[PDB]
Design a protein around this ligand. Structure first.
Ligand SMILES: Nc1ncnc2c1ncn2[C@@H]1O[C@H](COP(=O)(O)OP(=O)(O)OP(O)(O)=S)[C@@H](O)[C@H]1O
Ligand SMILES: Nc1ncnc2c1ncn2[C@@H]1O[C@H](COP(=O)(O)OP(=O)(O)OP(O)(O)=S)[C@@H](O)[C@H]1O
Ligand SMILES: Nc1ncnc2c1ncn2[C@@H]1O[C@H](COP(=O)(O)OP(=O)(O)OP(O)(O)=S)[C@@H](O)[C@H]1O
Ligand SMILES: Nc1ncnc2c1ncn2[C@@H]1O[C@H](COP(=O)(O)OP(=O)(O)OP(O)(O)=S)[C@@H](O)[C@H]1O
Lengths: 24, 66, 684, 66, 66, 66
């Protein structure tokens, strides 16, 4: 019999940006 | 084992923020959950050593180990 | 039986007395008992901020079981601290975590409400491989398990309210942040406990000081954790001061130095001097040992008094008859009166130390723990601080007004008198440049830290645009630099006592002045992530020259008062009426004069002497050369730096022109003599 | 159908406005600053709602909440 | 505490100003195109501030500076 | 095994930023916080290789291994 081996499980998250006008 | 040495051993960790999220897996045991009670009641004597940068980023996110 | 193998018997620790008797948490313990005595959803889980006693409630409940003062439905129960550690740590093979978990639940089912389950650290349970939630999420709302979780506020939201059914399997019990005086009472019970441990005495002004200071200065941790941080630390520190002494090491350095001197000389007299000093050192040594022994016996009889109190409470549990009156009327009055006899013996014989912990020691702990200087006015810093304006005229000549003002600011900080809603000095400098705004602030930093550019030096001339608000503050979540945070608030919360220069403040689009409306008003500012920073130990200083025409027009023939009033009108033309009310003091610089220019001439000469002494060369100056530098460095409109450009050119160009010429020799005084109208450099 | 006190204060400068709000906080909860002092002098841009409210999923501070 | 020298040259055009500066660079490194040349006549609006010193957090080209 | 080599071995790595972000999984350990100890003592004779921009983005994020 064998054992339930542990994993590594690479995960990821993201970013927004932001653009900004000028008035004139 | 360190309970079996009775405060004769000051534990030292360099780069403490390897410990928050040390081995979180299918079993999310993290090595922060396990050290948290011994660190609370002062049973160990663990001295960390961390950068001022990653103290913010990687340890102030885990507020109970703050 | 897994209960032997995979929990903690907390009732045994409370039985063997390994715990802190919790004062208070009346409503929340009674709330725990309310929620546990139900039929479905028999599971509360304590929620508060980390620190406020989410372990304390469960241990105080457990002692009340041991004290038996519970409501009758909880008599005879058991409190078992569920070990996620070993119950995961065995689980190597497949199914083992689930098998041990099942066997735990079957063994607790076999006890039938005899055992109140206590999960410590609830979020450790959930991810363990279905695997850990959906085994017990059935068994939770069937009454057969009485679990009391205890976990943080954040891990509730992030590790529980994800899986919403697991969330409805519980009851929130909102553990509050404890208040001021409740923290005081908690500290009194624990004062008795740390006077068991750390072999010292604790004063009651130490208690009110730890409460007042932890609530006031620090922001990061919470009551009553950090008041215990103060008290426990000061206990260890005073333990070290008794354990160590300064006069002994002074005399020890003296006797070893005179011993080395007499060994080098082998007229004498130093055998006699060394014998007298060794006798004095042995006398102070024996006094030190006698004082330590007196405090040692005091603590032994203090601890035996405490164990007598423990044993008579064991009698109140069991009910021994003669033991009650025996232990009381014998052991309490005689040991308390000889404890006080040892106390007044300490008050007689302690000469060389401190046996207690007072507000002085809490203040010393707090300043050496954070860095806000609230410790008592020790003598050397008091002498330095009384010599404020003696020192400030060694980097700023003239301009006495703001010199006095910042003198007042540092005083009313260190004397403690200032208003603790607001920062120390929210100053604002005016006056046309070349007069020493930036230099007054640099002189402050060197005064306060022994460092010139160790100050949070925001430079306001970048903030002409509408978005360097979120330069300084932080970047709000979802956006790019969220994970950094700002440059102001981060560099203040690293070191809560520093001087924010705001050089050249008029440049900005006035949104930055909305940010400073918060800053100067109440000293809290919110960073990007949302965690506030307390500015109430900082000296926010802003320089500007929005009064150039005015003060250059009318500094003569006017006072300081109408000066201030008219330039205040001019700032009201520029700045906002919302804002100049928040200023600590609108101060007005003024253009310099000839004695001042001669002073700055000498200062630049002295630092130049230092620079060429790092080169290794000696320089004298003719007084007529000083007249050249004075009349070459004078003007009304530009202030100081005409002097610096004149010094720079009319010294350093012919001088260093001669230096790399190899004309000049290391070893001669480079005397600065004059020609008709130019400095001549001679070598003799 | 509405929150209780939907107040808006006005007037000249420095005249006890924030004081009245701390006076309520001192009344209702016996604590001068125990009140959510969200300061509308940070929110001079569009993305500042994402400061105070929270973040849409997948992105940076989404799991911390606002 | 000040940079090495900060000079304001003047004149009519085409007399050698840019050549003095390029003569310095072609001295100091033997290169005209090893210097920093910020063509300040572009900067006719108040934005190119935020091209030379960089754009603050929460904006577009954040991680590449000015 | 390089400690076995008695200081007679020079380690060469190209794309050192890749090694910085090599094992950095979500709550794991990379080579960055494992070569933090063997390089401040420096028994491991590393030799680096990088592009200038991605040095700035990648390694200068991690100040200790900077
Ligand atoms: N009412 C109280 N009486 C006595 N000690 C208390 C009380 N409240 C808190 N403490 C002390 O505060 C410390 C722990 O308090 P807690 O509120 O349990 O913080 P914590 O629960 O340990 O934090 P976590 O996140 O649960 S590890 C211990 O030193 C307790 O003695
Ligand atoms: N009272 C003074 N004592 C000594 N040095 C001074 C004094 N006033 C100016 N200086 C010198 O002048 C320089 C600083 O000029 P400042 O008056 O500080 O210009 P500023 O105050 O920064 O105002 P602006 O905005 O820069 S024009 C330093 O090199 C100082 O050594
Ligand atoms: N009736 C009052 N009783 C006591 N103090 C008052 C009274 N009116 C004003 N104050 C004081 O005025 C100051 C008010 O601070 P703030 O509330 O920020 O000012 P505000 O006038 O309410 O509006 P802003 O935000 O300052 S423009 C405090 O220092 C109060 O002590
Ligand atoms: N004194 C000079 N020695 C050598 N070449 C020169 C000299 N003056 C002008 N030149 C040449 O003519 C060009 C014009 O000089 P520039 O300095 O570029 O013009 P300018 O005087 O700087 O005015 P700008 O910069 O164009 S507004 C140079 O690029 C050289 O090719």
């Amino acid at each position: 019999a064998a054992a339930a081996a542990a994993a590594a499980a690479a995960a990821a998250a993201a970013a927004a940006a932001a653009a900004a006008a000028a008035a004139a | 084992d360190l309970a079996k040495q009775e405060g004769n051993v000051i534990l030292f960790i360099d780069a403490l923020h390897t410990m928050v999220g040390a081995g979180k897996a299918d079993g999310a045991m993290d090595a922060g959950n396990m050290l948290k009670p011994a660190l609370a009641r002062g049973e160990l004597h663990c001295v960390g050593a961390t950068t001022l940068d990653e103290y913010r980023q990687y340890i102030e996110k885990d507020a109970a180990l703050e | 039986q897994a209960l032997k193998k995979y929990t903690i018997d907390l009732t045994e620790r409370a039985e063997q007395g390994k715990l802190d008797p919790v004062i208070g948490r009346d409503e929340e313990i009674r709330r725990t008992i309310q929620v546990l005595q139900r039929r479905t959803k028999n599971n509360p889980v304590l929620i508060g901020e980390p620190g406020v006693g989410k372990t304390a409630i469960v241990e105080g409940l457990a002692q009340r079981i041991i004290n038996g003062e519970v409501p009758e439905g909880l008599k005879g129960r058991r409190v078992l601290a569920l070990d996620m550690g070993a119950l995961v740590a065995g689980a190597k093979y497949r199914g083992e975590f689930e098998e041990r978990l099942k066997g735990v639940l079957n063994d607790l089912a076999k006890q039938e409400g005899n055992v109140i389950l206590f999960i410590d650290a609830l979020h450790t349970m959930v991810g363990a491989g279905m695997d850990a939630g959906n085994m017990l999420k059935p068994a939770l709302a069937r009454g057969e398990l009485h679990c009391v979780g205890a976990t943080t506020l954040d891990e509730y939201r992030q590790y529980i309210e994800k899986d919403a059914a697991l969330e409805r399997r519980f009851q929130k019990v909102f553990v509050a942040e404890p208040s001021v005086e409740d923290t005081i009472a908690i500290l009194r019970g624990l004062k008795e406990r740390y006077e068991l441990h750390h072999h010292v005495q604790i004063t009651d002004p130490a208690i009110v000081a730890a409460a007042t200071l932890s609530h006031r200065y620090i922001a990061d941790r919470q009551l009553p954790d950090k008041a215990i941080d103060l008290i426990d630390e000061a206990a260890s520190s005073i333990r070290m001061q008794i354990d160590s002494p300064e006069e002994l090491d002074r005399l020890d350095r003296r006797i070893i130095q005179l011993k080395l001197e007499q060994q080098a000389l082998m007229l004498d007299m130093l055998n006699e001097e060394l014998s007298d000093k060794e006798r004095q050192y042995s006398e102070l040594e024996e006094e030190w040992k006698a004082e330590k022994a007196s405090l040692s016996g005091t603590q032994t009889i203090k601890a035996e008094l405490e164990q007598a109190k423990i044993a008579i409470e064991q009698a109140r549990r069991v009910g021994d008859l003669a033991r009650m009156s025996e232990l009381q009327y014998g052991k309490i009055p005689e040991l308390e009166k000889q404890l006080e006899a040892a106390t007044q013996l300490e008050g007689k014989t302690m000469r060389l130390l401190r046996n207690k912990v007072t507000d002085a020691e809490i203040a010393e702990v707090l300043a050496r723990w954070t860095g806000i200087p609230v410790s008592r006015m020790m003598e050397s810093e008091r002498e330095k601080l009384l010599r404020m304006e003696q020192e400030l005229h060694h980097r700023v000549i003239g301009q006495n007004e703001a010199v006095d003002a910042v003198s007042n600011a540092i005083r009313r900080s260190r004397a403690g008198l200032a208003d603790p809603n607001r920062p120390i000095g929210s100053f604002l400098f005016l006056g046309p440049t070349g007069v020493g705004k930036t230099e007054l602030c640099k002189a402050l930093a060197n005064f306060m830290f022994d460092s010139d550019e160790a100050m949070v030096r925001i430079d306001m001339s970048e903030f002409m645009e509408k978005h360097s608000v979120s330069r300084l503050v932080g970047a709000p979540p979802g956006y790019v630099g969220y994970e950094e945070g700002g440059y102001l608030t981060e560099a203040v919360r690293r070191r809560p006592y520093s001087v924010i220069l705001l050089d050249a403040v008029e440049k900005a689009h006035p949104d930055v002045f909305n940010i400073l409306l918060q800053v100067l008003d109440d000293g809290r500012l919110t960073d990007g992530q949302g965690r506030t920073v307390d500015f109430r130990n900082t000296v926010v200083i802003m320089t500007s020259n929005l009064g150039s025409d005015l003060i250059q027009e009318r500094f003569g023939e006017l006072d300081y008062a109408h000066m201030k009033e008219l330039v205040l009108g001019v700032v009201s033309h520029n700045f906002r009426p919302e804002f100049i009310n928040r200023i600590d003091e609108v101060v007005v610089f003024h253009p310099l004069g000839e004695q001042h220019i001669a002073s700055i001439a000498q200062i630049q000469l002295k630092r130049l002497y230092k620079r060429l002494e790092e080169r290794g060369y000696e320089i004298h100056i003719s007084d007529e050369a000083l007249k050249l530098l004075s009349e070459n460095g004078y003007d009304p409109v530009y202030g100081a730096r005409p002097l610096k450009r004149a010094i720079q050119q009319q010294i350093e160009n012919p001088l260093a022109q001669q230096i790399l010429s190899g004309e000049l020799v290391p070893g001669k005084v480079i005397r600065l003599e004059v020609n008709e109208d130019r400095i001549v450099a001679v070598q003799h």
